[PDB]
Design a protein around this motif. Structure first.
Motif, PDB file in Angstrom:
ATOM      1  N   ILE A  25      49.516  40.757  40.700  1.00 49.18           N
ATOM      2  CA  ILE A  25      50.171  39.518  40.281  1.00 49.18           C
ATOM      3  C   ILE A  25      49.623  39.048  38.917  1.00 49.18           C
ATOM      4  CG2 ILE A  25      50.670  37.116  40.875  1.00 49.18           C
ATOM      5  CD1 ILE A  25      50.439  37.798  43.794  1.00 49.18           C
ATOM      6  N   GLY A  26      48.304  39.091  38.753  1.00 49.28           N
ATOM      7  CA  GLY A  26      47.677  38.676  37.510  1.00 49.28           C
ATOM      8  C   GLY A  26      46.991  37.316  37.538  1.00 49.28           C
ATOM      9  N   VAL A  27      46.898  36.708  38.721  1.00 48.49           N
ATOM     10  CA  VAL A  27      46.098  35.495  38.903  1.00 48.49           C
ATOM     11  C   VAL A  27      45.044  35.772  39.977  1.00 48.49           C
ATOM     12  CG1 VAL A  27      48.027  33.956  38.217  1.00 48.49           C
ATOM     13  CG2 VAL A  27      47.596  34.455  40.685  1.00 48.49           C
ATOM     14  N   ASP A  28      44.074  34.876  40.121  1.00 49.50           N
ATOM     15  CA  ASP A  28      42.991  35.082  41.074  1.00 49.50           C
ATOM     16  C   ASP A  28      43.483  35.148  42.520  1.00 49.50           C
ATOM     17  OD1 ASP A  28      40.593  35.205  42.442  1.00 49.50           O
ATOM     18  OD2 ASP A  28      40.016  33.140  42.010  1.00 49.50           O
ATOM     19  N   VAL A  29      43.239  36.276  43.182  1.00 51.26           N
ATOM     20  CA  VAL A  29      43.652  36.447  44.569  1.00 51.26           C
ATOM     21  C   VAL A  29      42.477  36.965  45.384  1.00 51.26           C
ATOM     22  CG1 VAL A  29      46.130  36.801  44.065  1.00 51.26           C
ATOM     23  CG2 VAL A  29      44.544  38.732  44.055  1.00 51.26           C
ATOM     24  N   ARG A  30      41.268  36.770  44.848  1.00 46.93           N
ATOM     25  CA  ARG A  30      40.052  37.268  45.477  1.00 46.93           C
ATOM     26  C   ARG A  30      39.931  36.854  46.939  1.00 46.93           C
ATOM     27  NH1 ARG A  30      36.255  34.807  43.707  1.00 46.93           N
ATOM     28  NH2 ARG A  30      37.211  33.593  42.005  1.00 46.93           N
ATOM     29  N   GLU A  31      40.397  35.649  47.263  1.00 45.91           N
ATOM     30  CA  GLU A  31      40.213  35.132  48.610  1.00 45.91           C
ATOM     31  C   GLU A  31      41.181  35.797  49.563  1.00 45.91           C
ATOM     32  OE1 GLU A  31      40.599  30.937  48.930  1.00 45.91           O
ATOM     33  OE2 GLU A  31      40.492  30.992  51.138  1.00 45.91           O
ATOM     34  N   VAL A  32      42.393  36.054  49.080  1.00 48.84           N
ATOM     35  CA  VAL A  32      43.379  36.766  49.879  1.00 48.84           C
ATOM     36  C   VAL A  32      42.914  38.221  50.066  1.00 48.84           C
ATOM     37  CG1 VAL A  32      45.785  37.600  49.951  1.00 48.84           C
ATOM     38  CG2 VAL A  32      45.245  35.253  49.188  1.00 48.84           C
ATOM     39  N   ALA A  33      42.435  38.835  48.989  1.00 47.96           N
ATOM     40  CA  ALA A  33      41.943  40.209  49.064  1.00 47.96           C
ATOM     41  C   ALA A  33      40.783  40.307  50.053  1.00 47.96           C
ATOM     42  CB  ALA A  33      41.527  40.710  47.692  1.00 47.96           C
ATOM     43  N   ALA A  34      39.846  39.369  49.958  1.00 47.00           N
ATOM     44  CA  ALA A  34      38.751  39.272  50.907  1.00 47.00           C
ATOM     45  C   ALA A  34      39.259  39.134  52.357  1.00 47.00           C
ATOM     46  CB  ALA A  34      37.862  38.096  50.548  1.00 47.00           C
ATOM     47  N   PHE A  35      40.230  38.250  52.590  1.00 46.27           N
ATOM     48  CA  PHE A  35      40.769  38.092  53.947  1.00 46.27           C
ATOM     49  C   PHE A  35      41.388  39.399  54.465  1.00 46.27           C
ATOM     50  CE2 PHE A  35      44.783  37.391  56.337  1.00 46.27           C
ATOM     51  CZ  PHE A  35      44.225  37.074  57.557  1.00 46.27           C
ATOM     52  N   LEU A  36      42.133  40.090  53.611  1.00 39.43           N
ATOM     53  CA  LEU A  36      42.819  41.314  54.028  1.00 39.43           C
ATOM     54  C   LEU A  36      41.823  42.406  54.430  1.00 39.43           C
ATOM     55  CD1 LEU A  36      45.946  41.376  51.631  1.00 39.43           C
ATOM     56  CD2 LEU A  36      45.820  40.922  54.099  1.00 39.43           C
ATOM     57  N   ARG A  37      40.752  42.535  53.651  1.00 40.08           N
ATOM     58  CA  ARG A  37      39.718  43.533  53.936  1.00 40.08           C
ATOM     59  C   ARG A  37      38.807  43.133  55.101  1.00 40.08           C
ATOM     60  NH1 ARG A  37      39.329  44.565  47.627  1.00 40.08           N
ATOM     61  NH2 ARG A  37      40.437  46.591  47.650  1.00 40.08           N
TER      62      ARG A  37
END
Length: 105
Positions: A25-37
């Motif tokens: 997407i190009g914006v901060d998604v670190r928290e979503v990525a963390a949740f998915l993993r």
């Protein structure tokens, strides 16, 4: 991560594709990525592989329609993940930031 070996392999693959999709997407998604993993049940990942899928072709609508906006939907990950309580809030933020990014143009 629990499940048969082939189940885990497949589930780890699904998660990495979805992390890629969100990170494109190009914006901060670190928290979503963390949740998915954080999801630790291979069968739960496999069963929901299509419901959660983030489509590259229309970001704004993928964001706005994502079942990760729904507390009721996220309840299925409640016994096998970390941070699901904050994810709808996260999506509000990401939607807010990504919307602004596009509309400054």
């Amino acid at each position: 991560m629990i499940g048969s070996e082939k189940q885990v392999n497949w589930a780890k693959s699904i998660i990495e594709k979805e992390v890629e999709a969100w990170e494109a997407i190009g914006v901060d998604v670190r928290e979503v990525a963390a949740f998915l993993r954080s999801i630790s049940d291979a069968r739960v990942i496999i069963d929901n592989r299509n419901l959660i899928h983030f489509q590259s072709s229309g970001i704004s609508y993928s964001l706005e329609s994502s079942p990760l906006n729904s507390p009721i939907f996220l309840r299925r990950f409640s016994a096998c993940s970390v941070g699901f309580e904050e994810i709808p809030t996260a999506l509000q933020r990401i939607r807010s930031v990504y919307t602004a990014k596009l509309l400054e143009d």
